[PDB]
């Protein structure tokens, strides 16, 4: 019920969490190094996921170019082949 109410107030969440740190720290219920390991793993993953969001996007932006650099060129050579087919048609067919 607090979580739904807090959605309208994003800046108010940060103050309560900061207040939550102080109450835990005064009564020695928060290890900073253990907390930092949770934070560092999350922020490195957050940095990695943003890179992963880039990695998926950088792959997909250049993936479709390879699939389209081939289909355009596969028809250009076939257009050239059809131009080559006119004059070879006048030549007689070989026996074998």
Q: For binding to other proteins (CB under 8 A), which residues are involved?
A: 55, 59-81, 83-88, 90-91, 93-94
Which CB atom, from 23 or from 84, has the smaller least distance to other proteins? 84
| Shortest CB 15 distance to other proteins, Å | 41
| Shortest CB 16 distance to other proteins, Å | 40
Distance CA 31, CA 24 (A): 9
Provide DSSP, 55-96: HHHHHHHHHHHHHHHHHHHHHHHHHHHHHHHHHHHHSPPP--
Which CB atom, from 42 or from 61, has the smaller least distance to other proteins? 61
Distance CA 32, CA 68 (A): 53
| Shortest CB 41 distance to other proteins, Å | 23
Which CB atom, from 28 or from 88, has the smaller least distance to other proteins? 88
DSSP 31: -
């Amino acid at each position: 019920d607090l979580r739904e109410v807090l959605s309208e107030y994003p800046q108010a969440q940060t103050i309560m969490e900061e207040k939550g740190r102080e109450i835990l720290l005064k009564m020695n219920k928060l290890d900073v190094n253990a907390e930092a390991a949770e934070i560092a793993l999350q922020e490195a993953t957050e940095s990695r996921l943003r890179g992963l969001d880039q990695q998926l996007d950088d792959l997909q932006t250049k993936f479709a170019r390879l699939l389209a650099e081939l289909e355009s060129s596969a028809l250009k050579i076939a257009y050239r082949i059809e131009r080559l087919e006119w004059q070879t048609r006048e030549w007689p067919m070989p026996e074998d």
